[PDB]
């Protein structure tokens, strides 16, 4: 029952608070793929082995993009295989009430100075938005890749559908990465 009409638009919350899980269907077994979302980038919050939200992007479901950034190497979740994820494949947020569905565009490696990949109409910062989008962020090296950090592995990745977490879960999903 993927639902394409507009998504259920989540509340800012306050720093360090949980926004949702993040499942990757790639990650499945490369991580334990439950990663906790929180708010806020420091490393009070990316340390938990969580992504954090950055705090001036829009928020899960709003029209923009919803930014988040993961340490490279943490255990147990991280975003170490980033570099996995190709045009087409999913990108789930679990919330407490809501499925949401994203289908990644791209991948861009830039300078972390290039803020633009995190704008609301992603690299376009002028650019007023329509549609919704999330965006992962982490390290990645010139020379030594994923144990460097001279620039950013950043991936795109627009809504395709939604689900209500009480109807219905998508068919990637494999197990429940939380509570009901
Ligand atoms: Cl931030
Ligand atoms: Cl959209
Ligand atoms: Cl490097």
């Given at each position: 029952?993927?639902?394409?009409?507009?998504?259920?638009?989540?509340?800012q919350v306050?720093?360090?608070?949980?926004?949702?899980?993040?499942?990757?269907?790639?990650?499945?077994?490369?991580?334990?793929?439950?990663?906790?979302?929180?708010?806020?980038?420091?490393?009070?919050?990316?340390?938990?082995?969580?992504?954090?939200?950055?705090?001036?992007?829009?928020?899960?479901?709003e029209?923009?993009?919803?930014?988040?950034?993961?340490?490279?190497?943490?255990?147990?979740?991280?975003f170490?295989?980033?570099?996995?994820?190709?045009?087409?494949?999913?990108?789930?947020?679990?919330t407490?009430?809501?499925?949401?569905?994203?289908?990644?565009?791209?991948?861009?490696?830039?300078?972390?100075?290039?803020?633009?990949?995190?704008a609301?109409?992603?690299?376009?910062?002028?650019?007023?938005?329509?549609?919704?989008?999330?965006t992962?962020?982490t390290?990645?090296?010139?020379t030594?890749?994923?144990?460097?950090?001279?620039?950013?592995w950043?991936?795109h990745?627009?809504?395709?559908?939604?689900?209500?977490?009480?109807?219905?879960?998508?068919?990637?999903?494999?197990?429940?990465?939380?509570?009901?």
């Open positions: 029952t993927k639902r394409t009409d507009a998504p259920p638009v989540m509340e306050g720093y360090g608070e949980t926004i949702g899980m993040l499942v990757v269907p790639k990650w499945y077994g490369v991580t334990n793929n439950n990663m906790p979302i929180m708010e806020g980038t420091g490393s009070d919050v990316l340390d938990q082995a969580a992504a954090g939200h950055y705090t001036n992007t829009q928020q899960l479901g029209v923009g993009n919803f930014a988040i950034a993961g340490h490279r190497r943490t255990y147990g979740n991280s170490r295989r980033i570099d996995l994820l190709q045009e087409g494949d999913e990108i789930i947020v679990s407490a009430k809501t499925w949401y569905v994203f289908k990644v565009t791209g991948h861009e490696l830039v300078k972390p100075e290039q803020v633009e990949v995190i609301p109409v992603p690299n376009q910062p002028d650019a007023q938005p329509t549609d919704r989008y999330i992962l962020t390290c990645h090296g010139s030594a890749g994923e144990f460097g950090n001279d620039l950013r950043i991936v990745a627009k809504f395709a559908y939604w689900m209500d977490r009480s109807e219905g879960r998508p068919e990637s999903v494999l197990n429940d990465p939380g509570v009901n």
